[PDB]
Chains A and B, each alone.
Chain A
Amino acid sequence: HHMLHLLEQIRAYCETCWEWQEAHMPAPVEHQICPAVCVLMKLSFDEEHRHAMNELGGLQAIAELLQVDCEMYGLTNDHYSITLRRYAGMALTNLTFGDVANKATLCSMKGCMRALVAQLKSESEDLQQVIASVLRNLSWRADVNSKKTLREVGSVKALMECALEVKKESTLKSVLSALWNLSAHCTENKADICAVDGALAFLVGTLTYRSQTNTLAIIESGGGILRNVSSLIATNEDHRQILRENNCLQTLLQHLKSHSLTIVSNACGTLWNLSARNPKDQEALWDMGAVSMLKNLIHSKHKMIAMGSAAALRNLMANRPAKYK
């Protein structure tokens, strides 16, 4: 009953906005919207409260509030507009978390999806962090239609272009988290990442990222994106050259020593694809001491570390240089 009261205020304002849109300007501060959505943002963390929202159509009301405000004011620097979009996006993130129906519902609302992707160019990096968090959950365990819609709206190129100009670590985590999920969907999603100018140079840079807090989130995310797209880079000489001049192969060998099992797994997966069909990078891996380091990881307890290290070793051992023996 109390949540119904809050959701009705949003829907009442949404209808007031659509009445103006058909004619042509209602402001959100006058109707007391940002306080109402701020309560729903906080209520969306609890699981029992999320079930109450889903029955009363809470995801649809909050999404349309975010949609209509983006269409009206655009990419404004107004505090009340941005703060409203932040609290709305934070609620949608929680509603999309662990709910296949809600992921499909927000994806199917194509007006809102276009409105979401446009906010990545905003000056507020807090807003970029909130938008990237929504796209992370939508990209995770996406159905066929949801995968196709995320590609249609152009979230892959928007997030990668955004990631270059990001300053804060919290924003950069959420953006790279979404791109890692998006890269795993299909081959065309991987091409869109590599197609962005200076994107591969950035992803190599994240391997040696100097973190503020004691966490390996940015290295795992950036290297995790690199692992997925390396299959396309393996069949491309131009992209390989970008990795050489930024020292990628030499860095990925250092990642084998890491205590983080994700970083080692990402490195072995990247070295699997890059080791095949290229005599130049093959000979480089022999010189840097890849055979010794990869031979240590063949007897690992985990599946992907053991599979990736053994497979990359197979490619190097099969194609020995003339210099050796």
Chain B
Amino acid sequence: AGESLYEK
């Protein structure tokens, strides 16, 4: 899935 900043 990977990494990410917050899904705003």
Contacts and interface: CB of A to CB of B under 8 A. Distances in A.
Interface string B1-8: 11111110
B1 A97 contact: no
B1 A133 contact: no
A140 B3 contact: yes
A270 interface: no
Interface residues of A, number: 24
A133 B2 contact: no
B7 A97 contact: no
A137 B3 contact: yes
A133 B2 CA distance: 11
A94 B6 contact: yes
Main secondary structure of the interface of A (DSSP, over half): helix
Contacts of A170: 7
Interface string A136-168: 110011000000000000000000000000000
B7 A129 contact: yes
Contact of A141 (B3, B4, B5, B6): B3
B1 to A, nearest CB: 4
Contact of B4 (A45, A137, A221, A224): A137
A224 B1 contact: yes
A181 B2 CA distance: 7
A129 B2 CA distance: 16
A94 B3 contact: no
Interface of A: 45, 90, 93-94, 96-98, 129-130, 133, 136-137, 140-141, 170, 173-174, 176-178, 180-181, 221, 224
Interface of B: 1-7
7 contacts: A93-B5, A98-B3, A130-B6, A140-B1, A140-B3, A174-B7, A177-B4
